[PDB]
């Protein structure tokens, strides 16, 4: 277990700050630059179609847990050299453990 849950508020502020400028929640959201992220945990990666993922994110094949999603939060090309994102990455956990939680629930 290596996952607090946090603000989901601060969390949901931190992704139009952050991840907002590619990418969207609602589930019938559309892709833009990144795709849609409705229902990513449980999820594996390179998956939603109509979206054209590098072929570095499709082998990869992550199961979008919690967990995972910090680690590649971290750092997203070290997570997966080749993914066309964009992505410096969340330093501090808090952060990320914030953000998660927004997810979490959005992405519901
Ligand atoms: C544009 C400058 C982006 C920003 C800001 C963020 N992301 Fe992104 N994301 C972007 C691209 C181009 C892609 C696809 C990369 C590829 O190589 O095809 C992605 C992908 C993701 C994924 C993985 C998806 C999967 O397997 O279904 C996740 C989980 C993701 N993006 C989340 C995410 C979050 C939470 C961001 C803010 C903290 C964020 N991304 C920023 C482009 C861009």
Redesign the pocket.
Same mark, same amino acid.
């Given at each position: 277990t290596e996952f607090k849950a946090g603000s989901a508020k601060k969390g949901a502020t931190?992704?139009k700050t952050?991840? $907002?400028?590619?990418?969207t929640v609602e589930k019938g959201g559309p892709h833009?630059?990144?795709?849609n !992220?409705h229902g990513?945990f449980g999820?594996?990666?390179?998956?939603?179609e109509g979206?054209?993922?590098?072929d570095?994110?499709?082998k990869?094949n992550?199961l979008?847990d919690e967990n995972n999603?910090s680690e590649? $939060?971290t750092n997203?090309k070290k997570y997966?050299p080749?993914?066309?994102?964009?992505?410096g990455? !969340?330093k501090k956990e808090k952060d990320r453990n914030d953000?998660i939680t927004y997810?979490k629930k959005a992405t519901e």
């Open positions: 931190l992704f952050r991840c $907002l400028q590619c990418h833009k630059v990144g795709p !992220l990513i999820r594996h990666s390179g998956q939603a979206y054209s993922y590098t570095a994110n499709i990869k992550v979008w999603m590649f $939060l997203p997966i080749g993914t066309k994102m964009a992505f990455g !969340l953000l997810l």
